[PDB]
Amino acid sequence: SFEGQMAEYPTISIDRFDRENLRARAYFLSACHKDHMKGLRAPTLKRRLECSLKVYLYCSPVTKELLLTSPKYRFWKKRIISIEIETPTQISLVDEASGEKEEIVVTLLPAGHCPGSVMFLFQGNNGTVLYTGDFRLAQGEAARMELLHSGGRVKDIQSVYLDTTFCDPRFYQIPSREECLSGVLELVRSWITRSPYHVVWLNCKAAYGYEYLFTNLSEELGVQVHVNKLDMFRNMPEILHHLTTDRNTQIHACRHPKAEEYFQWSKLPCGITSRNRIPLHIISIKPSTMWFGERSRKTNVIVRTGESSYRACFSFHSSYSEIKDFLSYLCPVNAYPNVIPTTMDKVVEILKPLCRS
Ligand SMILES: [Zn+2]
């Protein structure tokens, strides 16, 4: 529910390109999650870019590379500027009419394992603010980010605009990335090593975001992962070489036409059912967030749902305990939820005790 503008710097728009964001002096994109790209190729945005020539879109190098592979975003090509990771970079913001000059320093920080995903730290003459985008970091990772600190202590951060997808005490703990990855790996390994005819379908609905899962499975098991499309990774060999559009592989992450219901699926999306007329022996594995209360113990990241079907713990977002740790550490004046699980009322109030206001 973040609508693009932070109170401290209203002339910049982040992860939202419609409505009030049509008057931005600069744009920012944290990652190629579809829900962060609302309005990014709307005719009204194109209309506005034609009549405001010094407006740029800023993002990570990987995000820029991903965007410029898509024909529908190539109208941006002249005006997308990447900023290197953890490299504080001064940007000038131009008032097209009145000529007001505005200078801000932006630093891109890692946000988690989605390709090109970043947090944006903004430092200007109205305080320091952090926009996380979607994020989940390792233990101590924020503490190790030198550019979040000054003189040994955390920077004085006025406001944090953060991913509160699981900002409720019921989502207290989520198994770690390492636990999730190891679980899926060992499940896949135990299946595909039985014979060349044993195959896995990874049921991942989004077109973007699961690439670190595919690359790790591919690296560890020596198999390319089937995908619908890999041209976005044309210039990214470390991702590209773990993927394939050829369906003759033991690991598939191909996707059904988005229109189809889950209950209508009867086979791998790409339609391969046999090799040498030997039927393929298929299990389905669906990445799915699993969580545990404060007083509970974590259980197996793999949940069996049928003879040939499984769910596997996976999260793009921090648990409630991880959110608390992050905000306790940053100790901002304000914390604003980007996502409502409830209302901005339970969640803003849940975060209040971690802030200085
Ligand atoms: Zn396939």
Author numbering: 3 to 343, 346 to 361
Published text:
Artemis (SNM1C/DCLRE1C) is an endonuclease that plays a key role in development of B- and T-lymphocytes and in dsDNA break repair by non-homologous end-joining (NHEJ). Artemis is phosphorylated by DNA-PKcs and acts to open DNA hairpin intermediates generated during V(D)J and class-switch recombination. Artemis belongs to a superfamily of nucleases containing metallo-β-lactamase (MBL) and β-CASP (CPSF-Artemis-SNM1-Pso2) domains. The overall fold of the catalytic core of Artemis is similar to that of SNM1A and SNM1B (2 Å backbone RMSD); it has all the key structural characteristics of human MBL fold nucleases, with the di-metal containing active site at the interface between the MBL and β-CASP domains.
We crystallized three forms of truncated Artemis (aa 1–361) with substitutions in several of these metal ion co-ordinating residues, i.e. D37A, H33A, and the Omenn Syndrome patient mutation H35D. The overall architecture of the three variants is almost identical to WT Artemis. The D37A structure crystallizes with only one nickel ion (M1); Both the H33A and H35D variants exhibited loss of the M1 ion. By contrast, all three variants retained the Zn ion in the zinc finger-like motif of the β-CASP domain. Histidines 33 and 35 are the first two histidine residues in the HxHxDH motif (M1 binding) in the active site. In the absence of active site metal ions, the loop comprising residues 113–119 moves away from the active site and a small rearrangement occurs in α8 (residues 348–358). In both the H33A and H35D variants, α8 moves slightly closer towards β14, compared to the WT and D37A variant. In H33A and H35D variants, both β-strand E and α-helix E shifted upward and away from the zinc finger like motif. Differential scanning fluorimetry (DSF) analyses showed that both H33A and H35D variants are substantially destabilized with ΔTm around -13°C compared to WT Artemis. Our D37A, H33A, and H35D variants lost the ability to digest DNA substrate in vitro, in accord with results with full-length variants.
